[PDB]
Amino acid sequence: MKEKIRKKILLAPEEPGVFIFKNKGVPIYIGKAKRLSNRLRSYLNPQTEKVFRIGEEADELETIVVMNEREAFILEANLIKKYRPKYNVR
Ligand SMILES: [Mn+2]
Ligand SMILES: [Mn+2]
Ligand SMILES: [Mn+2]
Ligand SMILES: [Mn+2]
Ligand SMILES: [Mn+2]
């Protein structure tokens, strides 16, 4: 994993949000979290081959902090529909 992505993961807040891994400007995986810190730190010790792949292929990580868990649910669904990222199921 790129050093700048590891750093961004370790700085993420204990707040609800949506995250987007990208390569060459294109989203490759979109997810949501009750706490961005907890969900993103799981990428450092991969429990599945898919989590390993996403973290090695990415050249960028964007995070979006939201108002609450209701907003996280709808924003994540809308962005998956818009971008159809390679690692999200269809
Ligand atoms: Mn690494
Ligand atoms: Mn999801
Ligand atoms: Mn497995
Ligand atoms: Mn980055
Ligand atoms: Mn960007």
Side-chain angles (χ1 to χ4, degrees):
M1 172 182 279
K2 292 208 175 278
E3 181 50 56
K4 62 170 200 159
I5 297 176
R6 182 176 285 271
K7 181 172 185 203
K8 184 132 182 138
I9 287 170
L10 292 166
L11 289 171
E14 300 174 33
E15 296 288 347
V18 172
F19 58 93
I20 310 171
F21 288 93
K22 301 173 75 159
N23 191 34
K24 303 174 191 166
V26 182
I28 62 171
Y29 187 71
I30 296 175
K32 67 179 177 59
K34 298 190 201 312
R35 296 189 154 201
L36 284 164
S37 60
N38 298 351
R39 177 65 67 75
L40 288 171
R41 282 170 183 255
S42 79
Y43 279 73
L44 301 181
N45 292 305
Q47 295 294 334
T48 67
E49 297 267 11
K50 181 169 135 179
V51 168
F52 180 66
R53 292 179 184 109
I54 292 162
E56 298 302 297
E57 185 175 351
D59 69 8
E60 182 185 359
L61 174 58
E62 181 180 348
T63 60
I64 302 165
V65 175
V66 301
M67 297 190 290
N68 55 49
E69 294 175 21
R70 300 180 78 240
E71 193 179 10
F73 183 91
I74 184 159
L75 178 59
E76 185 210 22
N78 285 350
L79 296 179
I80 292 169
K81 284 179 260 178
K82 179 178 175 172
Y83 292 110
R84 294 293 182 185
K86 68 182 285 185
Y87 291 112
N88 285 95
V89 294
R90 300 186 200 203

